[PDB]
Amino acid sequence: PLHSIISSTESVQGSTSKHEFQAETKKLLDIVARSLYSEKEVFIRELISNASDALEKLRHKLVSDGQALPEMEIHLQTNAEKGTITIQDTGIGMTQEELVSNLGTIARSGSKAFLDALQNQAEASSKIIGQFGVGFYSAFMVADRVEVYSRSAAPGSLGYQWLSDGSGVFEIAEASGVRTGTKIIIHLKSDCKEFSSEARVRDVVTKYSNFVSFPLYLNGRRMNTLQAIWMMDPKDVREWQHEEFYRYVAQAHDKPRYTLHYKTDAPLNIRSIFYVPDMKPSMFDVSRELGSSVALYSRKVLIQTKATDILPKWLRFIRGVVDSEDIPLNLSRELLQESALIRKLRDVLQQRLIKFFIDQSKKDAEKYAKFFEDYGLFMREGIVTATEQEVKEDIAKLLRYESSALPSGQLTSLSEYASRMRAGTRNIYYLCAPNRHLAEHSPYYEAMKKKDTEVLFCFEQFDELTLLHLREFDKKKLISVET
Amino acid sequence: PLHSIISSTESVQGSTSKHEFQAETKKLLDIVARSLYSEKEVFIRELISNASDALEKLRHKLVSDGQALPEMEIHLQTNAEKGTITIQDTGIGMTQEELVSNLGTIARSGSKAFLDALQNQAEASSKIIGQFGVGFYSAFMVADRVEVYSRSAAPGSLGYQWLSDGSGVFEIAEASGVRTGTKIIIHLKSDCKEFSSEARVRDVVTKYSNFVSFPLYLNGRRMNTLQAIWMMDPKDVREWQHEEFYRYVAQAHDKPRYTLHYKTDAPLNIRSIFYVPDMKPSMFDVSRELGSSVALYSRKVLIQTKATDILPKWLRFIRGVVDSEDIPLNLSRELLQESALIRKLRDVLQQRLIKFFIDQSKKDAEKYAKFFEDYGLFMREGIVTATEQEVKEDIAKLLRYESSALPSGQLTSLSEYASRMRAGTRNIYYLCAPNRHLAEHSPYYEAMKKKDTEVLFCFEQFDELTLLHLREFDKKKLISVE
Ligand SMILES: Nc1ncnc2c1ncn2[C@@H]1O[C@H](COP(=O)(O)OP(=O)(O)NP(=O)(O)O)[C@@H](O)[C@H]1O
Ligand SMILES: Nc1ncnc2c1ncn2[C@@H]1O[C@H](COP(=O)(O)OP(=O)(O)NP(=O)(O)O)[C@@H](O)[C@H]1O
Numbered sequence: 001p002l003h004s005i006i007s008s009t010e011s012v013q014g015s016t017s018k019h020e021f022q023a024e025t026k027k028l029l030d031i032v033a034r035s036l037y038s039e040k041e042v043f044i045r046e047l048i049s050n051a052s053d054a055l056e057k058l059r060h061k062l063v064s065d066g067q068a069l070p071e072m073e074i075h076l077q078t079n080a081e082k083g084t085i086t087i088q089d090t091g092i093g094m095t096q097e098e099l100v101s102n103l104g105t106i107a108r109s110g111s112k113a114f115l116d117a118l119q120n121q122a123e124a125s126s127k128i129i130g131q132f133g134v135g136f137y138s139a140f141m142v143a144d145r146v147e148v149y150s151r152s153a154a155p156g157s158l159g160y161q162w163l164s165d166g167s168g169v170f171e172i173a174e175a176s177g178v179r180t181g182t183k184i185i186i187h188l189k190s191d192c193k194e195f196s197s198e199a200r201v202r203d204v205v206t207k208y209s210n211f212v213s214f215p216l217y218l219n220g221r222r223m224n225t226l227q228a229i230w231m232m233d234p235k236d237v238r239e240w241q242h243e244e245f246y247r248y249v250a251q252a253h254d255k256p257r258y259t260l261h262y263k264t265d266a267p268l269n270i271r272s273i274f275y276v277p278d279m280k281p282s283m284f285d286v287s288r289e290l291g292s293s294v295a296l297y298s299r300k301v302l303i304q305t306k307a308t309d310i311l312p313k314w315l316r317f318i319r320g321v322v323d324s325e326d327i328p329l330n331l332s333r334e335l336l337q338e339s340a341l342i343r344k345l346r347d348v349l350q351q352r353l354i355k356f357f358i359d360q361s362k363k364d365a366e367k368y369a370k371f372f373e374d375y376g377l378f379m380r381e382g383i384v385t386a387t388e389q390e391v392k393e394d395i396a397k398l399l400r401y402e403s404s405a406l407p408s409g410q411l412t413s414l415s416e417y418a419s420r421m422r423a424g425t426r427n428i429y430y431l432c433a434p435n436r437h438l439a440e441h442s443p444y445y446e447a448m449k450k451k452d453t454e455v456l457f458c459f460e461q462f463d464e465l466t467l468l469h470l471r472e473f474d475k476k477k478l479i480s481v482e483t
Numbered sequence: 484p485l486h487s488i489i490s491s492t493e494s495v496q497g498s499t500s501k502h503e504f505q506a507e508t509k510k511l512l513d514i515v516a517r518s519l520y521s522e523k524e525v526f527i528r529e530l531i532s533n534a535s536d537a538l539e540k541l542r543h544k545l546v547s548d549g550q551a552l553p554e555m556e557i558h559l560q561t562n563a564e565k566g567t568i569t570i571q572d573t574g575i576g577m578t579q580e581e582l583v584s585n586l587g588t589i590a591r592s593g594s595k596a597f598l599d600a601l602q603n604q605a606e607a608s609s610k611i612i613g614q615f616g617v618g619f620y621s622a623f624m625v626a627d628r629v630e631v632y633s634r635s636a637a638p639g640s641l642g643y644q645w646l647s648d649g650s651g652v653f654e655i656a657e658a659s660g661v662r663t664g665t666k667i668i669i670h671l672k673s674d675c676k677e678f679s680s681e682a683r684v685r686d687v688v689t690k691y692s693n694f695v696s697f698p699l700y701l702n703g704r705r706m707n708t709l710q711a712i713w714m715m716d717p718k719d720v721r722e723w724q725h726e727e728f729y730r731y732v733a734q735a736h737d738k739p740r741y742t743l744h745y746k747t748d749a750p751l752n753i754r755s756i757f758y759v760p761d762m763k764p765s766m767f768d769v770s771r772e773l774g775s776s777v778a779l780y781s782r783k784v785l786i787q788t789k790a791t792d793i794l795p796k797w798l799r800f801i802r803g804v805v806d807s808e809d810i811p812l813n814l815s816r817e818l819l820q821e822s823a824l825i826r827k828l829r830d831v832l833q834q835r836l837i838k839f840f841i842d843q844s845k846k847d848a849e850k851y852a853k854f855f856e857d858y859g860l861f862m863r864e865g866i867v868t869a870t871e872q873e874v875k876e877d878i879a880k881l882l883r884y885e886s887s888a889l890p891s892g893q894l895t896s897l898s899e900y901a902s903r904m905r906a907g908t909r910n911i912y913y914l915c916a917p918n919r920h921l922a923e924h925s926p927y928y929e930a931m932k933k934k935d936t937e938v939l940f941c942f943e944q945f946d947e948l949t950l951l952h953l954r955e956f957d958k959k960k961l962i963s964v965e
C-alpha cells in the first residue's frame with residue numbers, strides 16, 4: 001500500500017527578498033574547542049604550522065627583495081609554575097589590522113590569500129600549510145586565556161598585544177618591546193596542565209611536527225634532527241639514512257631488506273618510502289588481524305601515524321610514509337576526504353609495489369626467494385580475499401613454486417610456466433604436497449609423467465587453497481593433478 | 484647549547500580596543516561541503532534528522548498543550564527525470580523569522596535552543612538529534628539549488644519559500660499552498676545525479692536513518708519496519724526479534740548463540756545489545772576481519788557501522804549495537820570526541836562482557852565449552868596483547884584447560900585449580916601437548932606425577948604463548964613442566 005504526501009502545490013506569491021548568511025561566532029569557536037579535534041594535543045601541531053607558515057612568508061619576501069635572512073626559528077617554552085605553554089616565531093608577524101582580521105575573523109586565512117596571490121609560481125607555494133583559517137582557535141581547547149604578541153616585519157610597524165578567552169570578544173592594544181614575529185602565550189585550563197610539562201610537549205612535537213623545515217627549540221634545546229627523506233631526490237638518500245628512518249617510522253631495531261622510494265606527480269602527487277623488514281613475522285603477528293600501517297603526511301605535517309586506508313590489507317607487512325599535497329584533508333587534519341581518490345591512490349600504490357617486487361625477483365632471485373618464503377603468506381591472503389580477478393592475478397605474479405620440469409629447489413613463476421606450455425595446451429597443472437619427494441611419488445603425478453605435461457609443485461601452507469581461489473591465471477585454468 | 488629567544492620583554496603601553504569575532508560566511512559554507520564529511524550521501528542522514536527533530540518538537544508542543552497528534556510522517560521522493568530528491572515532513576515548520584534565522588545563520592541551532600529550554604526534563608530532551616547548527620548546509624555538497632517550503636504549525640501561519648544556490652545569499656518570499664511542515668527540494672549536480680535514483684537513496688536511508696522514530700516513506704514505500712530493540716526494556720524483547728535484529732545488524736544469516744541486553748548509566752547512558760554468532764570464526768589469518776564489529780548509534784542515528792574505539796580488539800568477534808544519547812560526537816557525526824569518557828566506556832564494556840561469559844559458564848557449562856573452543860583464540864590474543872596484568876588476569880578467567888586431577892575431557896578454569904591448591908603450595912603448573920595421551924606419557928610428566936601436584940593440560944593452538952605472556956594468575960606464577 002504505497003502512501004505519499006509529496007506533490008507540487010507551492011506557488012510563490014509575493015515579492016522576494018535577499019539576505020546574506022550570518023554566523024554565530026562564539027558557537028563556531030566552541031565547535032572548534034569541543035567537537036572538531038580527536039585530541040587536545042593537536043593545538044601544538046596547529047600553532048607550529050602557523051609559525052612555519054609565518055617564516056615561509058618572511059623567507060619569500062626577503063629572498064624576493066634581496067635582503068639577508070635573520071634568525072629563522074620556532075621556540076617553545078613550558079612554564080610549569082605559571083601553568084603556561086608559549087610558542088614564539090621570528091617570521092612575518094602581523095600588523096594591528098592583520099591581528100584584527102586574521103585572528104578575529106573565523107575561516108579568514110592570510111596564508112591561503114598569500115598562496116592565491118602567487119599564482120603558485122613560487123617555491124613557498126607547496127610549503128604553506130594553512131587553508132581553512134580555523135587552526136589557531138584550536139588553542140581554546142587547552143587555554144583559559146590566549147595572549148598574543150606580534151610585530152610585523154613591514155617598515156614602521158610596532159608591537160601589539162591580542163587577548164581573548166574565546167568568548168566572542170578579543171582585545172587589542174599597543175605593546176613593547178615585541179620582537180619581530182609572533183609570540184603566543186597560552187594560559188592552560190585546569191585539566192590541561194599536562195602541556196606545561198616539557199616531557200609531554202616533547203612527545204607532541206615529535207609526533208606531529210618532527211619534520212618542520214625550520215629549527216625548533218623546546219625550552220632551549222633543538223629537536224628536529226630528522227630530514228624528511230621522502231621529499232628528497234631518491235639518488236640523494238644513503239642506505240644509512242634509509243636504515244635510520246626505517247628504524248624510526250617502523251619503531252624497529254632491524255634493517256629494511258627492501259626499500260622503494262616512489263615519487264610521482266601524476267595522477268596524484270606522491271612522496272613515499274616503503275620498506276620490507278629484515279625480520280620475518282610470526283604466525284601470531286599475521287593472525288593478529290591488523291590492517292595496513294603507514295604514516296601519512298601532508299607537507300611534512302603528520303596526518304595519521306598509522307593510516308589503514310592507504311595500502312591494501314595484504315600489504316600490511318610494509319612500513320613507511322606517504323606524503324601528498326593533492327588529496328584534500330578533513331577540517332580536523334587528522335584524516336583524508338574524498339574516498340574514490342583515496343582508492344585511486346591505493347590502487348596506484350598497490351600496482352607500484354607489485355611491480356617493485358616483480359622487479360626485485362629479476363634483479364636478485366635468491367633474495368626474492370627468501371622474501372617469498374618469509375612474506376608469501378600475505379600474497380596468498382591477498383589473492384584469497386580480493387574480489388576483482390585482475391587483482392588476484394597481479395598478486396599471483398609474485399607467487400613461486402617448484403616444477404616437475406626444473407631441478408629440486410628451483411623456483412618458477414606462473415608466467416614462466418605459461419611460457420613453457422606447448423602449442424595448444426590450455427591449462428596450468430599443479431600438485432600440492434609437503435615436499436618434492438611426496439609430490440613425485442603421487443600416483444596422480446605418476447600418471448602425468450606418462451605425458452609431457454609440466455606440473456607445478458606447491459609445498460607452502462595454503463598453497464592449494466590459494467590456487468582454488470585464484471582459479472585461473474592468464475586465462476588458463478588452474479587444475480589440480482589429483483582430479 | 485642552551486639557546487632560547489623567549490623571555491618576557493612585553494609590556495602594554497597603549498589603550499585597549501574591544502572587538503567581536505567575525506566570520507567568512509561563504510567559506511564556512513564551503514568548508515562544510517568539502518572538508519567535513521567522508522561521504523556525500525550523509526546529507527540524507529542530516530535532512531532526516533532535521534525532519535525527525537521538527538516532528539519531535541511538534542509532538543512536544545501538542546502533547547504539553549493536551550492536543551491530539553496529527554499524522555507524523557517523513558517522506559522522500561526521487562525524480563530521475565527532473566534530477567531532484569525531495570524530503571518533506573509534517574512537523575513544526577518555520578515562520579519567516581525562523582527561516583531567516585535557523586537556515587540563514589551558520590551554527591544557529593533551533594533544536595539546541597529547544598533542548599536548552601527543556602533542561603533535560605522532557606521526553607524530547609533525549610530524542611532531539613541536532614546540536615551544531617551546520618547539518619542542513621550538507622545539502623550543498625550535492626546541490627546546485629535548494630528550495631525550501633515551510634509553514635509553521637502556529638495557527639494562522641503563512642507558508643514561505645527559502646531559496647539558495649549556496650553562494651552566500653538566499654531569498655525569501657511568500658508561498659501558497661504550503662502544508663504545515665517543511666518541504667526541501669534538492670536540485671542535484673551533474674555528478675550527484677545518483678541520489679535521484681530510488682535504489683541508491685533506499686540504501687542510504689536504511690544505512691543511517693533505518694531506526695528513525697517517525698514513519699518514513701520513500702516514493703510511497705515504508706522504510707523503517709524494524710524497532711530499535713536496544714531501547715526496549717530487556718524482558719520485553721523476545722527471541723524472534725533478537726534473531727531478526729541480529730541478522731540485520733550483523734549482516735548474518737545464522738542465529739546468535741549468546742545475547743546480552745545491557746543498559747546502565749556510568750560513565751554514560753548505554754543501551755546496548757551484544758551477540759555471539761552461532762557460527763564459528765573462519766580463523767584463518769584475515770579476510771574481512773577488519774570489520775565485523777558492534778555498530779555505534781546515538782539517538783537512533785548511526786554514527787559508525789563498525790565501532791572500533793568502544794570495545795577492545797579481542798572482543799571484535801561480538802556483533803550488536805551500542806547507543807548512547809550523551810556520547811560526545813564529532814562535528815562530522817562519523818566519530819566520537821576522544822576522552823576518558825570513551826576509554827572508561829571501553830573498560831566498562833570489557834568488564835561487563837567478561838562477567839557475562841563467566842556467568843554463562845556457570846549456567847550451561849557444555850554450551851560454554853563449545854564457545855570456548857570456537858572463540859578461545861580471541862581471548863588468547865587479548866591476553867598476549869593486553870598492557871595491564873589485571874586485564875590479562877580478567878580475560879584469563881575465561882580460559883579453560885584439562886587437568887591431571889580430572890577425568891579426560893573435563894575442563895577447569897584457573898580459579899578452580901587455584902582452589903584445589905594445597906596449603907603449602909605455590910604455583911600453577913601446566914603442560915602443553917597436542918592431546919591428553921601425549922601429555923600423560925610426556926617425559927616431563929612422569930618425573931612430575933610421582934609428586935602430589937596438579938598440572939593443567941593445554942591442547943589449544945597458542946596456549947603456550949598465552950600462558951607465557953600471562954606469567955601469573957591471582958599472584959601465583961605459571962610454570963611450565965617444560
Ligand atoms: N604565528 C603567526 N605569525 C603570523 N601570522 C599568523 C600566525 N599565526 C596565524 N597567523 C595569521 O592568522 C591566520 C589565521 O591562522 P589559522 O586560524 O591557523 O588559519 P590558517 O593557518 O590560515 N588555515 P588552517 O591552519 O588550515 O586552519 C593565518 O592565515 C595567518 O595569516
Ligand atoms: N525540516 C525542518 N523543519 C523545521 N525546522 C528545521 C528543519 N530543518 C532545519 N530546521 C531548523 O533549522 C535549524 C538548522 O538545522 P541544521 O543546520 O541541521 O542544524 P541543527 O539540526 O540545529 N544542528 P546539527 O544538525 O547537529 O548541525 C534547526 O535547528 C531547526 O531549527
Ligand SMILES: [Mg+2]
Binds near residue numbers: 046049050130135136
Ligand atoms: Mg594554521
Ligand SMILES: [Mg+2]
Binds near residue numbers: 529532
Ligand atoms: Mg540537522
